[PDB]
Write a protein that binds this DNA or RNA. Sequence first.
RNA 1: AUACUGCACAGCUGACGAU
DNA 2: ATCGTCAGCTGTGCAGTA
Lengths: 468, 111, 52
Amino acid sequence: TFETRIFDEPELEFGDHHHHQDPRLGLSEAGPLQTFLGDVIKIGVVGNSKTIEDTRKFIETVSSGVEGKGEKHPNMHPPFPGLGNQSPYRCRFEIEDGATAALTKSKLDKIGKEPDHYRAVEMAVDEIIGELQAMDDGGSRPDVAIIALPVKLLERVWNAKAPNFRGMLKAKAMGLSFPIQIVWEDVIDDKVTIPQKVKESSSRKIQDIAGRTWNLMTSLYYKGSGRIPWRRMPLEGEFSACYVGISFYREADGQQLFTSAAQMFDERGRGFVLKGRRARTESRGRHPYMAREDAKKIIEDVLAAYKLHHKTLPARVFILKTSRFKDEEADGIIAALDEAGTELRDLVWVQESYTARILRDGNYPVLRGTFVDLHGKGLLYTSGSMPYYGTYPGKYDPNPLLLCPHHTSESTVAQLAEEIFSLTKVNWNSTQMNQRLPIPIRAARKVGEVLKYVGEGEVISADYRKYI
Amino acid sequence: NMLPLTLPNEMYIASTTYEPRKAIAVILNGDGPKRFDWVINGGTFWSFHDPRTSACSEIVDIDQVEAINTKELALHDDIDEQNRFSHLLRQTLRYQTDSDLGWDKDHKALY
Amino acid sequence: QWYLIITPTYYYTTNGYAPHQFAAPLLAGKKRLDKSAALRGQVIMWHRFLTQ
RNA sequence: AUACUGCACAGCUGACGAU
DNA sequence: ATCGTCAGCTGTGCAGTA
Ligand SMILES: [Mg+2]
């Protein structure tokens, strides 16, 4: 029989050393980890007048406060504690007049009944980018720009009537001074209906009036303030580390392959650094995996960033990858680490396409945090039933992960599993607790999803506020 | 959901070579009794015995039987041999299956 | 110690032995209403199938 | 594309045998 | 010139919030 373990629920760190494990309750009790020095955050809105009025009504409505959804599960549906003296962010959001643009009906008609699926997206993105450029060059620049898409505009760039509108929008908006956030006209009022892509009989489904706000205002605060709301809780007596994430993506046409990396590491005070890179390392082959010199370059850039910030070198160079480590990749990584002079190192392949499952008796699945050591490999469950929520928030048997080291790591299994289970709840795009993937993979995927549409010879930035 | 297996003792190896996949297909249409637990690698038969009393001597041809225990076969740490061993286990799972049919072409199911 | 892994699933036919054109959405509809208790029972049923 | 989970489908990469 | 085996990786769409 194999040896099993059950991991505890990880705790986060909010302001003034509050501990707690729920983002919503911790934000409502102690507030953000990094408090904003100002008092107001300015927001700019772009769209037709109906969307602007809906957005204004929405923020003035949610300023007073929204009650909860249900009574059977109090923790899973907490009420939003207003936006005022009892705000969870200890700040205010204020939409200033004059920092608001508009799009004429004739201009949208030009992006209406127009042929081809690449020209119309081009006209829409260049008009929106030019309007934002004209807004930014004045004296009413906001801290975050909200793009409220009309219902009609969706029928030409998203539904039916082929690139990604969001990808080209983010790629063209990379060269700005403030990040942007896109809404879909049904988050701001519960009276509109957007049809689906292939079948028009159904429609989109929205979470809740109280569930929208807990994510939207958190993301808006992060994008418009630049301060991290929460972070993982460091232990006592652990070594200094630096986490790197590797991923691969294919371009729009040609089915060649590329490589993306993410460069998390901790901070001296109370902070957390999470950023991408500043280059793309060619398109060497349409296969997966990576070459040797690219791995050398990635490791060198990561160590250069850590040396620039901390004025020293880290003691752990933890590496995660979505594919099996070939011999040349490991050779390059080991050569770079040995030339740099670091002693501790871990290389882990995270696998999702496995078939072994754990079955228990009863109407509810296995607890979140069960680990089974399969003769060197590790089966870890990051989804399932939780006692804090009081139920299992899913619809089927959850999907476990298989962790496997490349025979040269300096730490044993059931410690890498503990670190990966610790690293999953840090995601400032959602407030839930049922997230499966750790952040070094999701960050690289989100970076690549926008880096697909950057043309040759353009400039790119390491800012994470321009990829989410 | 794991399940252990226990492999048989003896393994039979032949040296027939003039039989591609097409030849063994067109000979398994007109084979009579159906056992369906052989593989083709080129110059080898690689089956679980029954070389004469199985209506398979048209490809066996009473070749020089290399009686080798399967205990050394599973220990053969080679990927190319491991894929063929898994192929033989998969094809032997296709026995005791005509009573329950299944396995159309793609879903790898046993309906 | 060769190991076998079983993963329960469903196969749809129109009647007897014939493919169904609308075979894709029935799997999702059956998997959506399932619980986490039938899978273990199906697994031990398959084990009893193979052992007997 | 306020969000996450679960499922489905489609592509195309490596190692092995010959026509 | 594609056909068989073995292990994989990405995109593109729904349902459901327990
Ligand atoms: Mg977002």
